[PDB]
Amino acid sequence: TLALIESAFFVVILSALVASLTINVLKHHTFWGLEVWKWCVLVMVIFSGMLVTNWFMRLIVFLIETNFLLRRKVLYFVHGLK
């Protein structure tokens, strides 16, 4: 629910950033001494970075599961510090 809304917002921000990069019309507008596309890309960076951190944590957990090492202490440390 709430997580899905955040993911959708991050996807929308990424799409807007891609459109701004592809279309120079938005670049003509600037605010706070910086281009509007810069701020949009920054916000999309924050959101997509949260999403990428979650995805990378999941991928690291999966790789550790498939990894040959199976030390109990290492698994507990990873679970605690994820």
PDB file of N, CA and C in Angstrom:
ATOM      1  N   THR A   1       0.848  -1.226   0.000  1.00  0.00           N
ATOM      2  CA  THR A   1       0.000   0.000   0.000  1.00  0.00           C
ATOM      3  C   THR A   1       0.868   1.255   0.000  1.00  0.00           C
ATOM      4  N   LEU A   2       1.354   1.638   1.183  1.00  0.00           N
ATOM      5  CA  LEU A   2       2.210   2.816   1.279  1.00  0.00           C
ATOM      6  C   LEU A   2       3.498   2.624   0.489  1.00  0.00           C
ATOM      7  N   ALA A   3       4.106   1.440   0.590  1.00  0.00           N
ATOM      8  CA  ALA A   3       5.322   1.169  -0.170  1.00  0.00           C
ATOM      9  C   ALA A   3       5.051   1.206  -1.669  1.00  0.00           C
ATOM     10  N   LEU A   4       3.900   0.681  -2.095  1.00  0.00           N
ATOM     11  CA  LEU A   4       3.551   0.722  -3.511  1.00  0.00           C
ATOM     12  C   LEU A   4       3.408   2.158  -3.999  1.00  0.00           C
ATOM     13  N   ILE A   5       2.822   3.028  -3.174  1.00  0.00           N
ATOM     14  CA  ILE A   5       2.690   4.433  -3.549  1.00  0.00           C
ATOM     15  C   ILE A   5       4.065   5.068  -3.714  1.00  0.00           C
ATOM     16  N   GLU A   6       4.986   4.773  -2.794  1.00  0.00           N
ATOM     17  CA  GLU A   6       6.336   5.315  -2.903  1.00  0.00           C
ATOM     18  C   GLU A   6       7.033   4.809  -4.160  1.00  0.00           C
ATOM     19  N   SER A   7       6.868   3.522  -4.475  1.00  0.00           N
ATOM     20  CA  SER A   7       7.474   2.977  -5.685  1.00  0.00           C
ATOM     21  C   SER A   7       6.904   3.643  -6.932  1.00  0.00           C
ATOM     22  N   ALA A   8       5.586   3.850  -6.965  1.00  0.00           N
ATOM     23  CA  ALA A   8       4.973   4.522  -8.105  1.00  0.00           C
ATOM     24  C   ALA A   8       5.478   5.953  -8.235  1.00  0.00           C
ATOM     25  N   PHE A   9       5.613   6.657  -7.109  1.00  0.00           N
ATOM     26  CA  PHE A   9       6.136   8.019  -7.150  1.00  0.00           C
ATOM     27  C   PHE A   9       7.569   8.040  -7.664  1.00  0.00           C
ATOM     28  N   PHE A  10       8.391   7.086  -7.222  1.00  0.00           N
ATOM     29  CA  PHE A  10       9.767   7.014  -7.706  1.00  0.00           C
ATOM     30  C   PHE A  10       9.807   6.732  -9.202  1.00  0.00           C
ATOM     31  N   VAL A  11       8.942   5.833  -9.678  1.00  0.00           N
ATOM     32  CA  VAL A  11       8.893   5.534 -11.106  1.00  0.00           C
ATOM     33  C   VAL A  11       8.481   6.771 -11.893  1.00  0.00           C
ATOM     34  N   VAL A  12       7.489   7.509 -11.390  1.00  0.00           N
ATOM     35  CA  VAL A  12       7.046   8.724 -12.068  1.00  0.00           C
ATOM     36  C   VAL A  12       8.170   9.751 -12.105  1.00  0.00           C
ATOM     37  N   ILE A  13       8.906   9.888 -11.000  1.00  0.00           N
ATOM     38  CA  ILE A  13      10.016  10.836 -10.958  1.00  0.00           C
ATOM     39  C   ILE A  13      11.091  10.440 -11.962  1.00  0.00           C
ATOM     40  N   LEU A  14      11.402   9.144 -12.042  1.00  0.00           N
ATOM     41  CA  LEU A  14      12.398   8.683 -13.003  1.00  0.00           C
ATOM     42  C   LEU A  14      11.945   8.949 -14.433  1.00  0.00           C
ATOM     43  N   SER A  15      10.665   8.703 -14.724  1.00  0.00           N
ATOM     44  CA  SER A  15      10.149   8.973 -16.062  1.00  0.00           C
ATOM     45  C   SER A  15      10.224  10.459 -16.389  1.00  0.00           C
ATOM     46  N   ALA A  16       9.884  11.314 -15.422  1.00  0.00           N
ATOM     47  CA  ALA A  16       9.970  12.754 -15.644  1.00  0.00           C
ATOM     48  C   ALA A  16      11.409  13.185 -15.893  1.00  0.00           C
ATOM     49  N   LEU A  17      12.354  12.626 -15.134  1.00  0.00           N
ATOM     50  CA  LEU A  17      13.760  12.954 -15.347  1.00  0.00           C
ATOM     51  C   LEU A  17      14.223  12.509 -16.729  1.00  0.00           C
ATOM     52  N   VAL A  18      13.802  11.318 -17.159  1.00  0.00           N
ATOM     53  CA  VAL A  18      14.172  10.836 -18.487  1.00  0.00           C
ATOM     54  C   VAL A  18      13.601  11.753 -19.561  1.00  0.00           C
ATOM     55  N   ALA A  19      12.341  12.164 -19.403  1.00  0.00           N
ATOM     56  CA  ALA A  19      11.732  13.067 -20.374  1.00  0.00           C
ATOM     57  C   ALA A  19      12.463  14.402 -20.416  1.00  0.00           C
ATOM     58  N   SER A  20      12.825  14.939 -19.249  1.00  0.00           N
ATOM     59  CA  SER A  20      13.557  16.200 -19.210  1.00  0.00           C
ATOM     60  C   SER A  20      14.914  16.066 -19.888  1.00  0.00           C
ATOM     61  N   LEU A  21      15.600  14.944 -19.666  1.00  0.00           N
ATOM     62  CA  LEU A  21      16.876  14.718 -20.336  1.00  0.00           C
ATOM     63  C   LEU A  21      16.693  14.636 -21.847  1.00  0.00           C
ATOM     64  N   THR A  22      15.631  13.967 -22.298  1.00  0.00           N
ATOM     65  CA  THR A  22      15.400  13.808 -23.730  1.00  0.00           C
ATOM     66  C   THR A  22      14.862  15.079 -24.375  1.00  0.00           C
ATOM     67  N   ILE A  23      14.060  15.856 -23.653  1.00  0.00           N
ATOM     68  CA  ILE A  23      13.429  17.061 -24.182  1.00  0.00           C
ATOM     69  C   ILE A  23      14.068  18.267 -23.508  1.00  0.00           C
ATOM     70  N   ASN A  24      14.597  19.184 -24.315  1.00  0.00           N
ATOM     71  CA  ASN A  24      15.262  20.378 -23.813  1.00  0.00           C
ATOM     72  C   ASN A  24      14.295  21.515 -23.510  1.00  0.00           C
ATOM     73  N   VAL A  25      12.999  21.334 -23.775  1.00  0.00           N
ATOM     74  CA  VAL A  25      12.033  22.396 -23.506  1.00  0.00           C
ATOM     75  C   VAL A  25      11.989  22.709 -22.016  1.00  0.00           C
ATOM     76  N   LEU A  26      11.965  21.672 -21.176  1.00  0.00           N
ATOM     77  CA  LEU A  26      11.919  21.893 -19.734  1.00  0.00           C
ATOM     78  C   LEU A  26      13.180  22.582 -19.231  1.00  0.00           C
ATOM     79  N   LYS A  27      14.318  22.350 -19.889  1.00  0.00           N
ATOM     80  CA  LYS A  27      15.568  22.961 -19.452  1.00  0.00           C
ATOM     81  C   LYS A  27      15.528  24.481 -19.535  1.00  0.00           C
ATOM     82  N   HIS A  28      14.652  25.043 -20.370  1.00  0.00           N
ATOM     83  CA  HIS A  28      14.572  26.493 -20.499  1.00  0.00           C
ATOM     84  C   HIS A  28      14.105  27.163 -19.213  1.00  0.00           C
ATOM     85  N   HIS A  29      13.451  26.424 -18.321  1.00  0.00           N
ATOM     86  CA  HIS A  29      12.937  26.968 -17.071  1.00  0.00           C
ATOM     87  C   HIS A  29      13.879  26.607 -15.930  1.00  0.00           C
ATOM     88  N   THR A  30      14.185  27.590 -15.086  1.00  0.00           N
ATOM     89  CA  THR A  30      15.068  27.395 -13.947  1.00  0.00           C
ATOM     90  C   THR A  30      14.473  28.080 -12.726  1.00  0.00           C
ATOM     91  N   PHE A  31      14.831  27.574 -11.548  1.00  0.00           N
ATOM     92  CA  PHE A  31      14.346  28.131 -10.295  1.00  0.00           C
ATOM     93  C   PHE A  31      15.421  27.977  -9.230  1.00  0.00           C
ATOM     94  N   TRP A  32      15.418  28.902  -8.270  1.00  0.00           N
ATOM     95  CA  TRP A  32      16.375  28.890  -7.164  1.00  0.00           C
ATOM     96  C   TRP A  32      17.815  28.920  -7.666  1.00  0.00           C
ATOM     97  N   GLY A  33      18.045  29.574  -8.802  1.00  0.00           N
ATOM     98  CA  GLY A  33      19.373  29.651  -9.373  1.00  0.00           C
ATOM     99  C   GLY A  33      19.834  28.398 -10.081  1.00  0.00           C
ATOM    100  N   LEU A  34      18.964  27.402 -10.234  1.00  0.00           N
ATOM    101  CA  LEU A  34      19.313  26.157 -10.898  1.00  0.00           C
ATOM    102  C   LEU A  34      18.174  25.750 -11.821  1.00  0.00           C
ATOM    103  N   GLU A  35      18.518  24.969 -12.841  1.00  0.00           N
ATOM    104  CA  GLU A  35      17.521  24.517 -13.800  1.00  0.00           C
ATOM    105  C   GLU A  35      16.499  23.612 -13.121  1.00  0.00           C
ATOM    106  N   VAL A  36      15.247  23.716 -13.572  1.00  0.00           N
ATOM    107  CA  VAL A  36      14.177  22.912 -12.987  1.00  0.00           C
ATOM    108  C   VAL A  36      14.461  21.429 -13.183  1.00  0.00           C
ATOM    109  N   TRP A  37      15.014  21.063 -14.342  1.00  0.00           N
ATOM    110  CA  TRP A  37      15.364  19.667 -14.572  1.00  0.00           C
ATOM    111  C   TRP A  37      16.379  19.179 -13.550  1.00  0.00           C
ATOM    112  N   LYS A  38      17.271  20.059 -13.091  1.00  0.00           N
ATOM    113  CA  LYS A  38      18.238  19.665 -12.071  1.00  0.00           C
ATOM    114  C   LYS A  38      17.537  19.270 -10.776  1.00  0.00           C
ATOM    115  N   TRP A  39      16.586  20.089 -10.321  1.00  0.00           N
ATOM    116  CA  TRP A  39      15.862  19.771  -9.094  1.00  0.00           C
ATOM    117  C   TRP A  39      15.015  18.514  -9.260  1.00  0.00           C
ATOM    118  N   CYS A  40      14.364  18.365 -10.416  1.00  0.00           N
ATOM    119  CA  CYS A  40      13.574  17.162 -10.658  1.00  0.00           C
ATOM    120  C   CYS A  40      14.454  15.919 -10.627  1.00  0.00           C
ATOM    121  N   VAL A  41      15.628  15.989 -11.259  1.00  0.00           N
ATOM    122  CA  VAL A  41      16.548  14.859 -11.253  1.00  0.00           C
ATOM    123  C   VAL A  41      17.053  14.594  -9.843  1.00  0.00           C
ATOM    124  N   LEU A  42      17.249  15.645  -9.046  1.00  0.00           N
ATOM    125  CA  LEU A  42      17.692  15.448  -7.669  1.00  0.00           C
ATOM    126  C   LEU A  42      16.640  14.700  -6.857  1.00  0.00           C
ATOM    127  N   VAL A  43      15.377  15.114  -6.970  1.00  0.00           N
ATOM    128  CA  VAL A  43      14.311  14.453  -6.217  1.00  0.00           C
ATOM    129  C   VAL A  43      14.156  13.007  -6.679  1.00  0.00           C
ATOM    130  N   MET A  44      14.157  12.799  -7.999  1.00  0.00           N
ATOM    131  CA  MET A  44      14.118  11.443  -8.527  1.00  0.00           C
ATOM    132  C   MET A  44      15.317  10.639  -8.053  1.00  0.00           C
ATOM    133  N   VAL A  45      16.469  11.288  -7.884  1.00  0.00           N
ATOM    134  CA  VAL A  45      17.652  10.600  -7.384  1.00  0.00           C
ATOM    135  C   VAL A  45      17.423  10.137  -5.957  1.00  0.00           C
ATOM    136  N   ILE A  46      16.849  10.999  -5.117  1.00  0.00           N
ATOM    137  CA  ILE A  46      16.564  10.599  -3.738  1.00  0.00           C
ATOM    138  C   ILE A  46      15.652   9.375  -3.725  1.00  0.00           C
ATOM    139  N   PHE A  47      14.544   9.448  -4.467  1.00  0.00           N
ATOM    140  CA  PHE A  47      13.553   8.375  -4.404  1.00  0.00           C
ATOM    141  C   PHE A  47      14.093   7.082  -5.013  1.00  0.00           C
ATOM    142  N   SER A  48      14.676   7.169  -6.210  1.00  0.00           N
ATOM    143  CA  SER A  48      15.266   6.000  -6.841  1.00  0.00           C
ATOM    144  C   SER A  48      16.445   5.461  -6.050  1.00  0.00           C
ATOM    145  N   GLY A  49      17.123   6.299  -5.264  1.00  0.00           N
ATOM    146  CA  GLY A  49      18.189   5.798  -4.418  1.00  0.00           C
ATOM    147  C   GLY A  49      17.658   4.998  -3.249  1.00  0.00           C
ATOM    148  N   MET A  50      16.552   5.447  -2.655  1.00  0.00           N
ATOM    149  CA  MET A  50      15.893   4.621  -1.645  1.00  0.00           C
ATOM    150  C   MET A  50      15.467   3.281  -2.240  1.00  0.00           C
ATOM    151  N   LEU A  51      14.837   3.323  -3.417  1.00  0.00           N
ATOM    152  CA  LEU A  51      14.399   2.088  -4.062  1.00  0.00           C
ATOM    153  C   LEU A  51      15.584   1.182  -4.383  1.00  0.00           C
ATOM    154  N   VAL A  52      16.674   1.762  -4.888  1.00  0.00           N
ATOM    155  CA  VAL A  52      17.846   0.982  -5.263  1.00  0.00           C
ATOM    156  C   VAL A  52      18.523   0.408  -4.030  1.00  0.00           C
ATOM    157  N   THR A  53      18.521   1.148  -2.920  1.00  0.00           N
ATOM    158  CA  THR A  53      19.068   0.609  -1.682  1.00  0.00           C
ATOM    159  C   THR A  53      18.272  -0.603  -1.224  1.00  0.00           C
ATOM    160  N   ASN A  54      16.941  -0.513  -1.271  1.00  0.00           N
ATOM    161  CA  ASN A  54      16.121  -1.667  -0.907  1.00  0.00           C
ATOM    162  C   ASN A  54      16.405  -2.850  -1.830  1.00  0.00           C
ATOM    163  N   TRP A  55      16.450  -2.594  -3.140  1.00  0.00           N
ATOM    164  CA  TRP A  55      16.678  -3.669  -4.100  1.00  0.00           C
ATOM    165  C   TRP A  55      18.058  -4.288  -3.920  1.00  0.00           C
ATOM    166  N   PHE A  56      19.070  -3.463  -3.648  1.00  0.00           N
ATOM    167  CA  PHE A  56      20.423  -3.970  -3.462  1.00  0.00           C
ATOM    168  C   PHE A  56      20.534  -4.775  -2.177  1.00  0.00           C
ATOM    169  N   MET A  57      19.844  -4.350  -1.117  1.00  0.00           N
ATOM    170  CA  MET A  57      19.814  -5.158   0.097  1.00  0.00           C
ATOM    171  C   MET A  57      19.187  -6.518  -0.177  1.00  0.00           C
ATOM    172  N   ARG A  58      18.067  -6.536  -0.905  1.00  0.00           N
ATOM    173  CA  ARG A  58      17.434  -7.809  -1.240  1.00  0.00           C
ATOM    174  C   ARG A  58      18.361  -8.682  -2.079  1.00  0.00           C
ATOM    175  N   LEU A  59      19.028  -8.086  -3.070  1.00  0.00           N
ATOM    176  CA  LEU A  59      19.921  -8.850  -3.936  1.00  0.00           C
ATOM    177  C   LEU A  59      21.115  -9.391  -3.161  1.00  0.00           C
ATOM    178  N   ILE A  60      21.663  -8.596  -2.240  1.00  0.00           N
ATOM    179  CA  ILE A  60      22.784  -9.058  -1.428  1.00  0.00           C
ATOM    180  C   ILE A  60      22.348 -10.209  -0.535  1.00  0.00           C
ATOM    181  N   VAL A  61      21.151 -10.110   0.048  1.00  0.00           N
ATOM    182  CA  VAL A  61      20.640 -11.205   0.869  1.00  0.00           C
ATOM    183  C   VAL A  61      20.500 -12.469   0.029  1.00  0.00           C
ATOM    184  N   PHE A  62      19.942 -12.332  -1.176  1.00  0.00           N
ATOM    185  CA  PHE A  62      19.774 -13.493  -2.045  1.00  0.00           C
ATOM    186  C   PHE A  62      21.119 -14.104  -2.419  1.00  0.00           C
ATOM    187  N   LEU A  63      22.101 -13.265  -2.755  1.00  0.00           N
ATOM    188  CA  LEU A  63      23.420 -13.771  -3.119  1.00  0.00           C
ATOM    189  C   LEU A  63      24.077 -14.484  -1.945  1.00  0.00           C
ATOM    190  N   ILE A  64      23.955 -13.922  -0.741  1.00  0.00           N
ATOM    191  CA  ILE A  64      24.503 -14.578   0.441  1.00  0.00           C
ATOM    192  C   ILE A  64      23.823 -15.921   0.658  1.00  0.00           C
ATOM    193  N   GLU A  65      22.516 -15.990   0.395  1.00  0.00           N
ATOM    194  CA  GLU A  65      21.814 -17.265   0.499  1.00  0.00           C
ATOM    195  C   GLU A  65      22.386 -18.285  -0.478  1.00  0.00           C
ATOM    196  N   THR A  66      22.663 -17.860  -1.713  1.00  0.00           N
ATOM    197  CA  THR A  66      23.249 -18.751  -2.706  1.00  0.00           C
ATOM    198  C   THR A  66      24.753 -18.915  -2.531  1.00  0.00           C
ATOM    199  N   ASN A  67      25.391 -18.060  -1.737  1.00  0.00           N
ATOM    200  CA  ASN A  67      26.828 -18.157  -1.530  1.00  0.00           C
ATOM    201  C   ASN A  67      27.180 -19.450  -0.802  1.00  0.00           C
ATOM    202  N   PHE A  68      28.377 -19.966  -1.093  1.00  0.00           N
ATOM    203  CA  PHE A  68      28.818 -21.204  -0.461  1.00  0.00           C
ATOM    204  C   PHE A  68      28.942 -21.051   1.049  1.00  0.00           C
ATOM    205  N   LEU A  69      29.473 -19.923   1.514  1.00  0.00           N
ATOM    206  CA  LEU A  69      29.628 -19.708   2.946  1.00  0.00           C
ATOM    207  C   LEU A  69      28.276 -19.769   3.644  1.00  0.00           C
ATOM    208  N   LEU A  70      28.242 -20.456   4.790  1.00  0.00           N
ATOM    209  CA  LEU A  70      27.015 -20.611   5.561  1.00  0.00           C
ATOM    210  C   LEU A  70      27.274 -20.454   7.055  1.00  0.00           C
ATOM    211  N   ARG A  71      28.241 -19.618   7.426  1.00  0.00           N
ATOM    212  CA  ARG A  71      28.551 -19.416   8.835  1.00  0.00           C
ATOM    213  C   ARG A  71      27.349 -18.826   9.563  1.00  0.00           C
ATOM    214  N   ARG A  72      27.028 -19.399  10.725  1.00  0.00           N
ATOM    215  CA  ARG A  72      25.886 -18.916  11.494  1.00  0.00           C
ATOM    216  C   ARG A  72      26.105 -17.484  11.965  1.00  0.00           C
ATOM    217  N   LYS A  73      27.312 -17.174  12.443  1.00  0.00           N
ATOM    218  CA  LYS A  73      27.590 -15.825  12.925  1.00  0.00           C
ATOM    219  C   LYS A  73      27.468 -14.802  11.803  1.00  0.00           C
ATOM    220  N   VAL A  74      27.969 -15.138  10.612  1.00  0.00           N
ATOM    221  CA  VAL A  74      27.901 -14.207   9.489  1.00  0.00           C
ATOM    222  C   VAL A  74      26.451 -13.936   9.110  1.00  0.00           C
ATOM    223  N   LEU A  75      25.625 -14.984   9.074  1.00  0.00           N
ATOM    224  CA  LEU A  75      24.218 -14.802   8.732  1.00  0.00           C
ATOM    225  C   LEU A  75      23.518 -13.908   9.746  1.00  0.00           C
ATOM    226  N   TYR A  76      23.776 -14.131  11.037  1.00  0.00           N
ATOM    227  CA  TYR A  76      23.158 -13.302  12.066  1.00  0.00           C
ATOM    228  C   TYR A  76      23.619 -11.854  11.954  1.00  0.00           C
ATOM    229  N   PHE A  77      24.916 -11.640  11.716  1.00  0.00           N
ATOM    230  CA  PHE A  77      25.417 -10.279  11.552  1.00  0.00           C
ATOM    231  C   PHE A  77      24.745  -9.594  10.370  1.00  0.00           C
ATOM    232  N   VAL A  78      24.617 -10.304   9.248  1.00  0.00           N
ATOM    233  CA  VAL A  78      23.999  -9.720   8.062  1.00  0.00           C
ATOM    234  C   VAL A  78      22.544  -9.372   8.346  1.00  0.00           C
ATOM    235  N   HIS A  79      21.817 -10.290   8.985  1.00  0.00           N
ATOM    236  CA  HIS A  79      20.416 -10.029   9.294  1.00  0.00           C
ATOM    237  C   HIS A  79      20.274  -8.820  10.208  1.00  0.00           C
ATOM    238  N   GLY A  80      21.141  -8.711  11.216  1.00  0.00           N
ATOM    239  CA  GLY A  80      21.056  -7.587  12.131  1.00  0.00           C
ATOM    240  C   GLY A  80      21.394  -6.260  11.477  1.00  0.00           C
ATOM    241  N   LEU A  81      22.423  -6.240  10.630  1.00  0.00           N
ATOM    242  CA  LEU A  81      22.947  -4.998  10.078  1.00  0.00           C
ATOM    243  C   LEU A  81      22.383  -4.650   8.706  1.00  0.00           C
ATOM    244  N   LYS A  82      21.466  -5.455   8.164  1.00  0.00           N
ATOM    245  CA  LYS A  82      20.914  -5.155   6.847  1.00  0.00           C
ATOM    246  C   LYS A  82      20.276  -3.771   6.813  1.00  0.00           C
TER     247      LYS A  82
END
